[PDB]
Design a protein around this ligand. Structure first.
Ligand SMILES: OC[C@H]1O[C@@H](O[C@@H]2[C@@H](O)[C@H](O[C@@H]3[C@@H](O)[C@@H](O)O[C@H](CO)[C@H]3O)O[C@H](CO)[C@H]2O)[C@H](O)[C@@H](O)[C@@H]1O
Ligand SMILES: [Ca+2]
Ligand SMILES: [Ca+2]
Length: 254
């Protein structure tokens, strides 16, 4: 039961659904890309959203890309959210993501708003183990015991190079759990009924982006433009993002 979706048919991103996060300030992770609202970095063609990261002098940064979300226009509580994505070769340094923030962000600061990572790929452990494009993770980031930043992370080595074709990345979110899937197959699961996880019982909205680099202590391990070796331009193709409703789903659309 699809109750919401973006099929990305047109020739332009629907600005009544999406907003762009613009800046080159690193986004809390020492990222190197300047995320822009330009057609060069985010565009539709042939039935896909394309987010394209480029090696390019722009606003004091050495790369451009995009980071888009549906804050203020779409949010939901409970359901299955799935996207059909063909990630780029993360080689070394590209960091695609599909993820969700609580709908009270940014008024409620991270991580008190709650966060769920559906797909993250391009991590330093992958790079060290020669599993670039196979090793992914899902995650929860929230205010845990003591209200202190807490992260729960599940790693999965996919059987195939995920940049070679489209795959389905899904969260299944109920009043008791959040579960994460690749091509229908569960690879992560957390109970969310504990007192410290009430932030997961409010509406959330999705975000899609392709970051380049991070601090050495952050996701990619690669903190300078000269350390990025990935094939650029790097294109993440998103054929569609769909919400499958549950009985308890609350859909929020202004
Ligand atoms: O501002 C409060 C606090 O924010 C911290 O920065 C975080 C980023 O670490 C965070 O990274 C996301 C990951 O947690 C994960 O969800 O995956 C996505 C996609 O890859 C990441 O972007 O994103 C949040 C929201 O933008 C930031 O607030 C700073 O590190 C910290 O110093 C600061 O105190
Ligand atoms: Ca909490
Ligand atoms: Ca499509």
């Amino acid at each position: 039961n699809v109750i919401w979706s973006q099929e990305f048919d047109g020739e332009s991103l629907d600005r009544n659904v999406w907003s762009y996060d613009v800046g080159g300030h690193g986004f809390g992770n020492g990222q190197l890309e300047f995320n822009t609202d330009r057609p060069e970095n985010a565009y539709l063609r042939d039935g896909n959203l394309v987010i394209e990261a480029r090696r390019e002098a722009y606003g004091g940064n050495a790369f451009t890309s995009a980071r888009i979300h549906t804050r203020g226009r779409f949010a939901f509580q409970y359901g299955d959210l799935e996207a059909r994505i063909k990630v780029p070769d993360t080689s070394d340094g590209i960091w695609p993501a599909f993820w969700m923030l609580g709908n009270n962000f940014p008024g409620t600061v991270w991580p008190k708003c709650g966060a769920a990572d559906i797909l993250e790929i391009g991590g330093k452990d992958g790079i060290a183990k020669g599993l670039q494009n196979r090793q992914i993770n899902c995650a929860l980031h929230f205010a845990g015991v003591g209200e202190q930043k807490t992260s729960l992370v599940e790693w999965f080595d996919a059987p195939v190079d995920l940049h070679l074709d489209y795959h389905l990345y899904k969260i299944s979110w109920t009043p008791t759990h959040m579960k994460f899937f690749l091509d229908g197959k569960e690879f992560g699961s957390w109970d969310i009924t504990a007192s410290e996880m009430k932030e997961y019982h409010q509406p959330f909205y999705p975000i899609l982006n392709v970051a380049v680099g991070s601090w050495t202590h952050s996701y990619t391990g690669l903190d300078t433009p000269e350390k990025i070796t990935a094939t650029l331009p790097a294109r993440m193709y998103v054929d569609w993002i769909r919400l499958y409703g549950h009985p308890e789903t609350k859909l929020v659309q202004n």
